[PDB]
Amino acid sequence: DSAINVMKWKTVSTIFLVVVLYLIIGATVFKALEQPQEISQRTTIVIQREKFLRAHPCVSDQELDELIQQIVAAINAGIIPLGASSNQVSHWDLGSSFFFAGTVITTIGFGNISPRTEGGKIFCIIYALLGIPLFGFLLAGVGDQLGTIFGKGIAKVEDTFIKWVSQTKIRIISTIIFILFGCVLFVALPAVIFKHIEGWSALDAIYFVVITLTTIGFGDYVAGGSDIEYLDFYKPVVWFWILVGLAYFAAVLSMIGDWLRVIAKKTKEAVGEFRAHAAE
Amino acid sequence: SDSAINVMKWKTVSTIFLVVVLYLIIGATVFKALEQPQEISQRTTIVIQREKFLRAHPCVSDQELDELIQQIVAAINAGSHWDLGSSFFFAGTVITTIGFGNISPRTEGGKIFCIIYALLGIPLFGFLLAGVGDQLGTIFGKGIAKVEDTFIKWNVSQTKIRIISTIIFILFGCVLFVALPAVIFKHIEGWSALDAIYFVVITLTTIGFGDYVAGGSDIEYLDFYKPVVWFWILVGLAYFAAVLSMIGDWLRVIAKKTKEAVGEFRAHAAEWTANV
Ligand SMILES: CS(=O)(=O)Nc1ccc(C(=O)NCc2ccc(Cl)cc2Cl)cc1
Ligand SMILES: CS(=O)(=O)Nc1ccc(C(=O)NCc2ccc(Cl)cc2Cl)cc1
Ligand SMILES: CCCCCCCCCCCCCCCC
Ligand SMILES: CCCCCCCCCCCCCCCC
Ligand SMILES: CCCCCCCCCCCCCCCC
Ligand SMILES: CCCCCCCCCCCC
Ligand SMILES: CCCCCCCCCCCC
Ligand SMILES: CCCCCCCCCCCC
Ligand SMILES: CCCCCCCCCCCC
Ligand SMILES: CCCCCCCCCCC
Ligand SMILES: CCCCCCCCCCC
Ligand SMILES: CCCCCCCCCCC
Ligand SMILES: CCCCCCCCCC
Ligand SMILES: CCCCCCCC
Ligand SMILES: CCCCCCCC
Ligand SMILES: CCCCC
Ligand SMILES: CCCCC
Ligand SMILES: CCCCC
Numbered sequence A: 001d002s003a004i005n006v007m008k009w010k011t012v013s014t015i016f017l018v019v020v021l022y023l024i025i026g027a028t029v030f031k032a033l034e035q036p037q038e039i040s041q042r043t044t045i046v047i048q049r050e051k052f053l054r055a056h057p058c059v060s061d062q063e064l065d066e067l068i069q070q071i072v073a074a075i076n077a078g079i080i081p082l083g084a085s086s087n088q089v090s091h092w093d094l095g096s097s098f099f100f101a102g103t104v105i106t107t108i109g110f111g112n113i114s115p116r117t118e119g120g121k122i123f124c125i126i127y128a129l130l131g132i133p134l135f136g137f138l139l140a141g142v143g144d145q146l147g148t149i150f151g152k153g154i155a156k157v158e159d160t161f162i163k164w165v166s167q168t169k170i171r172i173i174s175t176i177i178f179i180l181f182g183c184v185l186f187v188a189l190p191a192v193i194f195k196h197i198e199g200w201s202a203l204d205a206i207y208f209v210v211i212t213l214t215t216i217g218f219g220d221y222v223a224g225g226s227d228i229e230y231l232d233f234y235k236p237v238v239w240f241w242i243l244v245g246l247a248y249f250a251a252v253l254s255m256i257g258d259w260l261r262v263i264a265k266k267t268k269e270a271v272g273e274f275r276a277h278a279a280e
Numbered sequence B: 001s002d003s004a005i006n007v008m009k010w011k012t013v014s015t016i017f018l019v020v021v022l023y024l025i026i027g028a029t030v031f032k033a034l035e036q037p038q039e040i041s042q043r044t045t046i047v048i049q050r051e052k053f054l055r056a057h058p059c060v061s062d063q064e065l066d067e068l069i070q071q072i073v074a075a076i077n078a079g080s081h082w083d084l085g086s087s088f089f090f091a092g093t094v095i096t097t098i099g100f101g102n103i104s105p106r107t108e109g110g111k112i113f114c115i116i117y118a119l120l121g122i123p124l125f126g127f128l129l130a131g132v133g134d135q136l137g138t139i140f141g142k143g144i145a146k147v148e149d150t151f152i153k154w155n156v157s158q159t160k161i162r163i164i165s166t167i168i169f170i171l172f173g174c175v176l177f178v179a180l181p182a183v184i185f186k187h188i189e190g191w192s193a194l195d196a197i198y199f200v201v202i203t204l205t206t207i208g209f210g211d212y213v214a215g216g217s218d219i220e221y222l223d224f225y226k227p228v229v230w231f232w233i234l235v236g237l238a239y240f241a242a243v244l245s246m247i248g249d250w251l252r253v254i255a256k257k258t259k260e261a262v263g264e265f266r267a268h269a270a271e272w273t274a275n276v
């Protein structure tokens, strides 16, 4: 029993170090990419500050930094503190609390909207702990249904491509068609609709798709997030997209996992060779 | 018959789908019931503070306030955020799919790298998290070998003691991975006791709203704090993975028990109505 456990802990620990190292590379590449724009916006926000620090000296000026604290603290709930727009829609209306519930059970958790009430928080804890598992079943069923829809599709395509054919190499043609068609239906096509309806850039759309469907859900972009107009054919279609798109990414991510298993065997055995053939 | 099983399958999906739709509807109404009020009371008392800042400082005209707020909304779309350690944290938020979003890429390259980083990193982390799950799982397996010996040579024996074991998992698990860290968070972050547990749950379920983030404020943090929080995430995620999974099983059970209870209720209105 302990013989396999010693072999297991050895594997976990190496993957752990790989993960630590993956984070370090990651970290350096993100700071390489973002630290600059952050500094150029931090210098040009101090420029804008001084233009109204000294352009109104009759303001206490310790209370300006405190004013902004009260705006940024209050923006998190979601305020539109203007006199040319003192009338305002609700964040917790019939539909947005529905959306919010969606963000909890799917663990996307955008967080543009999140509970402020101690009761809302306590309900959210309970709602999540029951809802996440519940949704998991739905998402599984959605995965199966969609899986068998594609099974009927590959029965028709693995017959017509039976020319003068291997068992294990037509598997490679199938997984390409899964990724190809899948990226159209669940990534490309919806990003295009998002690009048009939200006014996002082409990158922002795909970025949103991926961040949402991987359940990362930063919440920097949220489809349905602004007050624009919205056809109301729109948002329901986006629910359905989430439902099926999450199922799709579940598989895709899972495939990527398998590819890593493979690449990890191939590299484990390559290093053994490379060590043994020190001559080279 | 191949379509015969598929009609039975789609029947199952569709009922769970309706249960989910209905779970969302109840949810929706309970959240709006809870939050629509605080929203109104903060919308009245933010308009009060708005007008209260024109009168208590007449130096500021009404036209320059609207422009100030434009520059503050511009600056929420930035905020160092991206130092050595916070970009490390950020990477953590991507691969774990917690995704707080207090920090997120603004550069078109940062976004493209994030897409790639995620698609490779999420699966990679999943392996780590699995290993962490196993190790922790067998640590508790040795723990229950010692506790299912000392209690199993005396009072009421097998088939109900499985229920006592799962309570010990939940009891001790909630101490180690929820209570104890919430207490540390309460003290170190200055959050309320509820806010701490709220954070724990929102983070460890990988929902990660990002309303609260441990390490998120500009406080003197002991060098030992943040790394301990990494370790907590690693093990706490593994813990919730199991817990959530258990809850799933309980639902499976409760769903059979309710499916057959409806079958009973039906079957007695049957042979009670045949009685004419
Ligand atoms: C900023 S707001 O909260 O005040 N306004 C709203 C914002 C979004 C939505 C909505 O339904 N979007 C589609 C959707 C559905 C379910 C899930 Cl899980 C994710 C997504 Cl993107 C509705 C209102
Ligand atoms: C605006 S900021 O970027 O400067 N604030 C920060 C916030 C948090 C951390 C950090 O390391 N927290 C521990 C931690 C680790 C990994 C994961 Cl996944 C989640 C968590 Cl909560 C660093 C900076
Ligand atoms: C207009 C560009 C759209 C590109 C869509 C991104 C693809 C995300 C899915 C991951 C699998 C991609 C296969 C590439 C093999 C290296
Ligand atoms: C109009 C500008 C559109 C820019 C589209 C570029 C997106 C490229 C996505 C890269 C996906 C790489 C997949 C790697 C899988 C491991
Ligand atoms: C964003 C790209 C990051 C790429 C990840 C780094 C590659 C690390 C390779 C680790 C090699 C360890 C070999 C051990 C074999 C037993
Ligand atoms: C047969 C599988 C259903 C696929 C239907 C396409 C859904 C795309 C929704 C895009 C909306 C933004
Ligand atoms: C384009 C980036 C490719 C990164 C390849 C990841 C390989 C991980 C190997 C894990 C070894 C155990
Ligand atoms: C630090 C040592 C670097 C070793 C480089 C090996 C890269 C593995 C690629 C595997 C493709 C088959
Ligand atoms: C939110 C909980 C409501 C309970 C719904 C019961 C569903 C009845 C279907 C039973 C299967 C025959
Ligand atoms: C404008 C509010 C949008 C809510 C749509 C609810 C319908 C859910 C059905 C899922 C296909
Ligand atoms: C447009 C930004 C792309 C960054 C490329 C980083 C690739 C790193 C590979 C390290 C082996
Ligand atoms: C500080 C009070 C927090 C209470 C949390 C209640 C959780 C009950 C779990 C039900 C699944
Ligand atoms: C808190 C009670 C949740 C009830 C779920 C029951 C599932 C019913 C499936 C028929
Ligand atoms: C046999 C399954 C019924 C499918 C209904 C339409 C969705 C593909
Ligand atoms: C073995 C229990 C570890 C708990 C760590 C708590 C740190 C916040
Ligand atoms: C304090 C209100 C509790 C709602 C569950
Ligand atoms: C998280 C429970 C889902 C079961 C497939
Ligand atoms: C219909 C517009 C296509 C954008 C690539």
Ligand SMILES: [K+]
Residues within 6 Å of the ligand: A109, A110, A111, A112, A217, A218, A219, B099, B100, B101, B102, B208, B209, B210
């Ligand atoms: K978030």
Ligand SMILES: [K+]
Residues within 6 Å of the ligand: A107, A108, A109, A110, A111, A215, A216, A217, A218, A219, B097, B098, B099, B100, B101, B206, B207, B208, B209, B210
């Ligand atoms: K999130």
Ligand SMILES: [K+]
Residues within 6 Å of the ligand: A106, A107, A108, A214, A215, A216, B096, B097, B098, B205, B206, B207
């Ligand atoms: K998640």
Ligand SMILES: [K+]
Residues within 6 Å of the ligand: A107, A215, B097, B206
């Ligand atoms: K998950």
Ligand SMILES: [K+]
Residues within 6 Å of the ligand: A107, A108, A109, A110, A215, A216, A217, B097, B098, B099, B100, B206, B207, B208
């Ligand atoms: K998330």
